[PDB]
Amino acid sequence: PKHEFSVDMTCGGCAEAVSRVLNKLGGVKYDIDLPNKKVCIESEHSMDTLLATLKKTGKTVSYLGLE
Amino acid sequence: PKHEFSVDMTCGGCAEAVSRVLNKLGGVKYDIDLPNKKVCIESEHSMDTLLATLKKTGKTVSYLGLE
């Protein structure tokens, strides 16, 4: 399952912080698109776990959809 | 007690994220100095708790000690 999220990243640092919390979670393959403020995650982790993980950054996150 | 932390924030978005995680924790009085990458926190929360809360952002965090 490839989950797509909007994440309000406004600099390179914001992008790297997203990658670090995702790394900490583990069991993920992801790509972070800074200019489009979009994070795509391939994972067996539920949408709720991914959402909660991303929201720990303190950034504004919303779910865009799936696959 | 009055604690000081270094937090590797590079833009205003990074400062907001720190603000959001500290607000979510509660029981804190803080000020964020973006250009100096420093966050001062007065709290009854342990150093451990404050450290862990800051490290949630996925930003690089270190401890600058008691004021």
Sheet with B2-7: list strands edge to edge. B28-33, B38-43, B2-7, B61-66
> 3-class SS at A29?
strand
Query: Which tokens is B12 given?
Result: 């205003």
Chain A residues closer than 8 Å to B10 by CB: 11-14
Identity at B27, one-letter amino acid code: G
Chain A residues closer than 8 Å to B20 by CB: 58-59
Q: Of the candidates A10, A11, A17, which has its C-beta nearest B58's C-beta?
A: A17
As a whole number of angstroms, the distance between CA A42 and CA A4 comes to 9
As a whole number of angstroms, the distance between CA A9 and CA B19 comes to 15
Taken in order A42, A32, A26, A65, the sign of the CA dihedral is negative
Chain B residues closer than 8 Å to A24 by CB: 58
Taking a C-beta distance cutoff of 8 angstroms, is the pair A17, B19 a contact? no
DSSP β-ladder status, A38-43 and A2-7: antiparallel
> What is the residue whose two structure tokens read 């720990």?
A56
Looking from the CA of A28 toward its CB, the CA atoms found within 13 Å total: 25
Residue A40 in marked binding region: no
> 3-class SS at A4?
strand
Q: Helix crossing, B12-25 with B47-55: angle to 10°? A: 130
CB contact under 8 Å between A24 and B57, yes or no, is no
CB contact under 8 Å between B17 and A14, yes or no, is yes
Mind telling me how many Å the CA of B66 is from chain A's nearest CA? 25
Topology at the third CATH level for domain B1-67: Alpha-Beta Plaits (3.30.70)
